[PDB]
Amino acid sequence: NMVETEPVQGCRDFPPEAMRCRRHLFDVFHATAKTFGFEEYDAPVLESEELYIRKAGEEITEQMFNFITKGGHRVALRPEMTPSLARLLLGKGRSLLLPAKWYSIPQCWRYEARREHYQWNMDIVGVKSVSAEVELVCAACWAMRSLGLSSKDVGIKVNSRKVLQTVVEQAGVTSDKFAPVCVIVDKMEKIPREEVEAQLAVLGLEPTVVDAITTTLSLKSIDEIAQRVGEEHEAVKELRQFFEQVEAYGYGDWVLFDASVVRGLAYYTGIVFEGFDREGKFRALCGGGRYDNLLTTYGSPTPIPCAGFGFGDCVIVELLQEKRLLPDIPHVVDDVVIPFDESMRPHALAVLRRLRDAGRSADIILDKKKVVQAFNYADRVGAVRAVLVAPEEWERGEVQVKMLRGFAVPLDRLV
Amino acid sequence: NMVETEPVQGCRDFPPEAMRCRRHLFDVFHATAKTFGFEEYDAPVLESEELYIRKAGEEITEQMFNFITKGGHRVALRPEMTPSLARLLLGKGRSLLLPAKWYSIPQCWRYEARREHYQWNMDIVGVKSVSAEVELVCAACWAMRSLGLSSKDVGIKVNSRKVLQTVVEQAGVTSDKFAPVCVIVDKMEKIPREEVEAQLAVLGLEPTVVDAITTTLSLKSIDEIAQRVGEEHEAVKELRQFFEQVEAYGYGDWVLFDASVVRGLAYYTGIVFEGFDREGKFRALCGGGRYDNLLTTYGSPTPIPCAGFGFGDCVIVELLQEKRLLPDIPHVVDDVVIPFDESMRPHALAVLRRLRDAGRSADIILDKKKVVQAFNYADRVGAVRAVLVAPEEWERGEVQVKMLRGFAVPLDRLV
Ligand SMILES: N[C@@H](Cc1c[nH]c[nH+]1)C(=O)O
Ligand SMILES: N[C@@H](Cc1c[nH]c[nH+]1)C(=O)O
Fold first, then answer.
1. Of ligand 1's atoms, which has the minimum distance to the CA of residue A82?
2. Dist CA B182 CA B196 (whole Å)
3. Which of B81, B177, B187, B370 is the most buried (most CB within 10 A)?
4. Could you tell me if B64 and B49 lie in one domain?
5. Rounded to whole angstroms, what are the CA distances from A242 to A235, A288, B398?
């Protein structure tokens, strides 16, 4: 029998073909981070399970890929990066210089009865003002633009949880139900409205409060939220500022207000946002927001404002494929060095060294094969040039070069 | 209280400082792979535990970080990449084109009562001749050279298991004890010779056979192995060819013969090799060899020759640090855009866009701060240029640029 060739249940293999696609995407994530002044970090995929106990009914924490070690504790393959980021920030001492702009491209994990995805994370730490969210949304737009998408293809929808926070506060509800409410109300587009209301009732919320919540989610303009919660309410000022700053940067066509956007995570406190395709065909492309309390929650002596997003590797690829923006780009190499026969191998190796020393990418024919088969290989591997190392030419201090009709060239002029 | 800021027991955090070091190393691994014509792949860190059942007493398999899922099976965080590579190769159909040269930089895991390391893997598939091992050893040398090491610092020791294979065969021992013998004999430098002999006796090996094994490991020349097993023995021809090919490529000073090198993995069948520091201060820098039977073992209908190495991220870094070849390279960015005050923020954002559109890396001051504090930040983040966006200049279609005494420059001439 054969060994099992399929990977573990919910997990992806990346042979070279699929890896090029992933690298194409990751190259954009690194390049955009660099363009925006963000610094790379990483942490272990294995974290203490205690890091993810939030008690808000979040899908992210419910679907934890956890297990017990033995000697150690209860651990989990990380379902997200943000708790790890906060751990690193706190573990950094007073030596953490603010503002800090950190990014990573972690694999994250889930379990249900797709268990693995990569997620670009970008976070700005120590910045109170909406300029953090502006920069983050602009980075997400820049990355999509770098991938060949335009504002005709995609948008980013923006809201502030401070609106719903006030509506909930003024209705007489305890603030400890706010996060679970956000979590439930996040389900609006996914489940029937009566079911959202049913779940809010199970939380103990009165029908008039539920209606207030319902209503605010469906207001189509910022001017309309200004009517409900006050024109100088801090969400109104912050959203106006957010839009005017994104407009000034030149991404006005990419962004829009949507009162129904809350996101599914407990810890967002301010502006929240979600990337979407304008044909309404795919799930969220990316999502994030401000989370000013999380570090306090983790034991920071002083509050540290934060905002950030995650941008998954799966939805974006489906969208780019639909838009024909991910053609296969076959493997290439600059040179294939071809020994005329095995006696020429030592000389061909010196030639291969010379080429690589000059910054070229180059293969040599490894097993014994005829020149015609060697040219076949050169075509297969996508060589720009074949360098044939034959006895006559070698005597003259030359090799034969064919751009892929073969011409003798002095060794020195190869590079 | 604070959340636990330390990572899970045997695992490393990579905040930006430490991440730069890792990126410096990984950049070399990618660059060397590219130079040598290797193609990147990846697979899930989670694999079926069945993939690693070899029954040879290997340290690698004994120290498995395994667990049971629930719905799924018995799984492990991969202790090595080679089984995953073989799975991918087999899962690729007749559509696998040979020879193939594939590389990856996986995190690998172990458990003992350091649990995590990254390991550059390079493997050549479908090549019978020693030219595979030549190319692989040259790649390891090229990577170390790229990191600033020379043949004065490091070497690669080379042997062939075919020598010990014959000695074991001629002594009348069953071939199913060969791998476990290799595994035990790998321990020679680590444990007393009598203990190696003790372990070989526990395997059921007779004292005269043990002595034959002992003796062959201590022969200092290939000419001496030629005396024992025959001058045209295939290990002798292959080692001679290996050395002459590495010499021709120009790395003769990096490589040497050592009859004691066997490596600790069950599946090596031919040439094996190990990178080492010439001061005798560190553990193996890298290690690999030919493994012609593994794919057959996994159910390949036809034999597929393979050779490859792993190159860890931990020993090399300790060595480079000792040699002062890993200085911190602080973060830099091309431009910091400084609004003169908050009213200038929209204009500063248009300027930031312009700079980034031109391929520059640039920050803007995010929170409100005084110009003097903004210059402090610019120094902190390692900006090459501060771009001050002030009212007077803006009116003239200009900004102020300071190389890090401030001069007015037309917007267009910024880039
Ligand atoms: N951790 C969030 C994304 C995020 C990063 N920073 C803030 N939010 C998620 O997984 O959706
Ligand atoms: N898997 C080996 C290295 C290797 C890669 N290819 C062949 N050997 C190890 O972990 O040491």
1. 1
2. 11
3. B81
4. yes
5. 10, 15, 25
**CATH number of the domain residue B248 falls in:** 3.30.930.10
Q: Number of helices (H) and strands (E), helices first, in chain A?
A: 15, 17
Answer yes or no: do A72 and A159 share one domain.
yes
Q: Is the CB of A400 under 6 A from ligand 1?
A: no
Ligand nearest to the backbone CA of B266: 2
Q: Note the Cα B276 to chain centre separation in Å.
A: 14
| Cβ atoms within 10 Å, residue B278 | 12
Q: State the Cα–Cα distance between residues B370 and B339, nearest whole angstrom.
A: 9
Same domain, A332 and A319: no
Name the percent of chain A in helix, strand, coil, to the closest 5.
40, 20, 40
Alpha-carbon dihedral angle through residues B98, B101, B107, B110, given to the nearest 10 degrees: 60
User: What are A14's strand-pairing partners?
Assistant: B42
What technique determined this structure? X-ray
Both A308 and A343 in one domain: the answer is no
Total domains in chain B come to 2
Give the residue whose CA is nearest to atom 11 of ligand 2.
Answer: B310
Residue of chain B with shortest Cα separation from A65: B69
Contacts of A40 in chain B (CB under 8 A): 16, 19-20, 23
How far is it, in rounded angstroms, from Cα B30 to Cα B143?
A: 9
Token pair of A344 as six digits: 């020429």
* Cβ-proximal residues to A204 (8 Å cutoff; 6+ apart), any chain: A177
Please give the number of the atom of ligand 1 that sits closest to the Cα of A60.
Answer: 10
**Which residues of B are less than 8 Å from A249 in CB distance?**
349-350, 352-353
Answer yes or no: is A263 a known binding residue.
yes
Report chain A residues whose CB lies below 8 A from the CB of B19: 39-42
Q: For residue B158, which of B87, B284, B257, B85 has the smallest C-alpha distance?
A: B257
Range of the structural domain that residue B223 is part of: 1-325
CB A82 within 8 A of CB A72: no
B400 and B331 in a common domain? yes
Q: How far apart are CA A310 and CA A288, in angstroms?
A: 6
